[PDB]
Amino acid sequence: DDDDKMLAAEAANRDHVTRCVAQTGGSPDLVAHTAALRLYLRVPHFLTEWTTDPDRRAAVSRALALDIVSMKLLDDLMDDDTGLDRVELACVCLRLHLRALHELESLARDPKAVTDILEQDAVHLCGGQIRTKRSRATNLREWRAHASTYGSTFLGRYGALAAACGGEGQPADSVREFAEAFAMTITMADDLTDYDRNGERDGNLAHLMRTGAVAGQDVVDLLEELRGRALAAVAAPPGAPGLVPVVHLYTDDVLVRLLPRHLGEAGAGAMATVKFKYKGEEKEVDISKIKKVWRVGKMISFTYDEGGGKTGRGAVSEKDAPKELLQMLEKQ
Amino acid sequence: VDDDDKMLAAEAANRDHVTRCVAQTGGSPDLVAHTAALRLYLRVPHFLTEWTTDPDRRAAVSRALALDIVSMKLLDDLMDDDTGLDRVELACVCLRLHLRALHELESLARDPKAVTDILEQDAVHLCGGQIRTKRSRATNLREWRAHASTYGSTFLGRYGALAAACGGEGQPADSVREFAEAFAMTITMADDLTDYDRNGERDGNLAHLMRTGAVAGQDVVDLLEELRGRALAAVAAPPGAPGLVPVVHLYTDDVLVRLLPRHLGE
Ligand SMILES: CCCCCCCCO[C@@H]1O[C@H](CO)[C@@H](O)[C@H](O)[C@H]1O
Ligand SMILES: CCCCCCCCO[C@@H]1O[C@H](CO)[C@@H](O)[C@H](O)[C@H]1O
Ligand SMILES: CCCCCCCCO[C@@H]1O[C@H](CO)[C@@H](O)[C@H](O)[C@H]1O
Structure with missing residues (x-):
């Protein structure tokens, strides 16, 4: 049912937005374009999750949807690659934004x-967007610094707004x-999706990954940190x-x-291994070398x-058995 | 001493507040000069604040208005995409100026x-109005003035209302x-009749209608006198x-x- 609330909020937000866009005169196109913004339309639901009154919650939620969409239209306008009419975008962008305020x-x-x-933080957001497109990121640190403006700061403002408008x-x-x-x-999900869905390359994280400039494990850690x-x-x-x-x-x-699409064969950080003594020795083997x-x-x-064709042998306590080994077990 | 000296100083003060803001948010020199070249847009706020007696309040309302008017103008440059300026800069500086003005x-x-x-x-009236103006061009004075009442009249009307709400008793x-x-x-109208030559402008352009006979000089004269x-x-x-x-x-x-003599019928 929390999942039912979510869906119903997304639908209510979608409704509010499309009505407002058509009444301003945007084509059925632009109307379809905005109704398509499912996550952007649902995010306001997450931002208003602390709001106890349901009537205020639905009202704040769709108001945030209006402005988030408006800003997305502004972005579409700056890249001019959606096919959409430049004028309806501009005008619809402004209109939704004023309604939201x-x-x-x-x-x-x-x-x-x-x-x-x-x-x-308008300067941080606006100058940050300019810099993001003016100087494409070439490593994780840069990619992250850029994303903290058009991603983090961008949504954080709506977070602050949800709290400012959501009562007690x-x-x-x-x-x-x-x-x-x-x-x-x-x-991040977006960069790794749009590498293909959209054909994006410069400054894109999936590209930096496929290119070697950023390593899988560092992406996993950032995701874990977030x-x-x-x-x-x-x-x-x-x-x-x-x-x-x-x-x-x-x-x-x-x-x-998404990660596997850009890392390939076990793109973690290190081939798992098993350590053990065999015939007085010290051996370590890559799970990749393991047969039965x-x-x-x-x-x-x-x-x-x-x-x-030299078959090696070993036996270890399951307590010293790397997860990967234990899996071939259940997988054997 | 005179009003002209006040106007000139206001315009200068508005221009500087605008350019400082464009530059600090990352606007490039081409974009910065572009905003400084919007002369009348930077001056008009002086006219709208003429009822404000306190000179400090007046200067402050005037420059805040200038920020937003420049902002809407950049957004317009952005939709027409014909200025040869970076769309990302236009868009970003556009938003920044608008938020500062609010x-x-x-x-x-x-x-x-x-x-x-x-x-x-009247956001709908202005935004839906701007879409139709561009959709289907004017073919006579009736249609021309109907369109201009949105992107011209309503558009400045709002700033007139803002000047009063922010200008005290x-x-x-x-x-x-x-x-x-x-x-x-x-x-x-002035702009339309200057823009003819300075834009390669025809469809819905008042001077074009005048030169092609679709619009009569006396009607234009009349409209100007009514205004x-x-x-x-x-x-x-x-x-x-x-x-x-x-x-x-x-x-x-x-x-x-x-301007009118530049556009006799034929
Ligand atoms: C969607 C609304 C954004 C644009 C609204 C109009 C912004 C100002 O637009 C300007 O208005 C002038 C007034 O005569 C015209 O002559 C100019 O050519 C036009 O650029
Ligand atoms: C109502 C507020 C301003 C709208 C009318 C302004 C139109 C005339 O303004 C003119 O626009 C030209 C084109 O951008 C500029 O080159 C000129 O310097 C400027 O004076
Ligand atoms: C100056 C204008 C700044 C607003 C543009 C960014 C706001 C919405 O822009 C969106 O940001 C997303 C991250 O949230 C990106 O993944 C999307 O590609 C982008 O469309």
Whole structure:
């Protein structure tokens, strides 16, 4: 049912946005383009998760949807590659944005709160976007510094806005920290998806990965860092435990579905190995060399490839058996 | 000492506030010079704040208005994509200026909410209006003035309403707006009749219609006189802004004396 709320909020946000876009005169095209922004349309649901009143929640949620979409249209306008009419984009972008300011301001805890948040880091956001397209990233550090502006800062502002407009019990800093961490996970997913869906290369993370400039394991660590930051934010009282599955879902999808498309054969960080003594020795073998493996009580017995058609042998306690070895077990 | 010295200083102050903001947010020299070349856009806020007595408040409202008007102008350059400027810079500087203006205007308004109320009020009329203008070009004075009332009149009308909401006591709000709406149409015509040669502009362009006979000189003269009268009236309502009277005459007469002759029928 939390999943049913999510869907219904996304649908309500989609509705609010498309009606507003058609009434301003945008084509059925642009209308389809915006209704297609499913995550952008659902994110407002996550940002408003700390809002106790449901009537305020739905109102804040769609107001955020209006502005997030408007900013996405602005981005479409700067790249001019959607096929969409430049004029309807411009005009629809502005219109949604003014509607959003009106709605958010009508729900804010203070009359200056909305414009303070939008102004506070406008230079960081705007100059940051310019710099992102002016100097393509060539390593993880650069890719990350750029993504913290058009991804993190970008969504963080909406996080601050959700807290500013969501009545009582909103832990301002936490909603915003959730937003900035979640935005980066989402931005990464996007780069690794759009490498192909879109044909993107310069400054793109999937390209940097396929190119060697950034290593799989460092991407896993950043994803893990972002997961932890988001979980902590979501844990600060009064808590938004409903966001826990959400954070896992997105992080895990990047790890399980998207990374492999750019890392290949076991793109972790190191070929797993098994250590053991055999005939007074000290041996270590790559799970890749391992042929057969079976269990005798709590011991794990196996055979492997030494060099040529030279069959090696070994047995270890399961406690010293790397997960990878234990898997060939159940897989044998 | 005179009003001309006040106008010139305001324009300069507006230009500098604008260029400093464009440069700090990453705008390049071509984009910075481009915003400094929008002369009338930087000057018009001086006219709209003419009812504001306190000179500090006036200078502050005037430059905040200049930020947003420049912003909308960059967004327009962005949709037409014909200036040869970087679309990312235009877009980003556009947003930055607009957000700074919201912030400066809300800090000056009696009631902050009034700033978003005014901008929402006729957002559809202005944005849907700008789409149709570009969709289907004007073919006669009727159609031309209907379109200009959106991207010209409503467009400046809003800033007129903002100048009143942010300019303290006095301000006869409906009149400031009426002045802005009529004056905006006069300069939009002016611009259209300069833009002919300076843009390779034909469809829906008033000068094109004039030269091809679709529009009659006397009707244009009439429209200009109607606009002058409406503007003179707006500035004579109380409290009154006498300083705008010669301004209304200067721009109207310039269109009648210098621009129209450039466009006889055939
Ligand atoms: C109503 C607020 C301003 C709208 C009318 C301004 C149109 C005339 O403004 C003119 O625009 C030209 C083209 O960009 C510039 O080259 C000129 O310097 C400027 O004076
Ligand atoms: C100056 C304008 C800044 C706003 C542009 C970025 C805001 C939305 O832009 C979007 O950002 C996403 C990350 O959230 C990217 O993954 C998408 O490719 C991009 O469309
Ligand atoms: C969607 C609304 C954004 C654009 C609104 C109009 C912004 C100003 O647009 C300007 O207005 C002038 C007024 O005469 C015209 O002459 C100029 O050619 C035009 O660029």
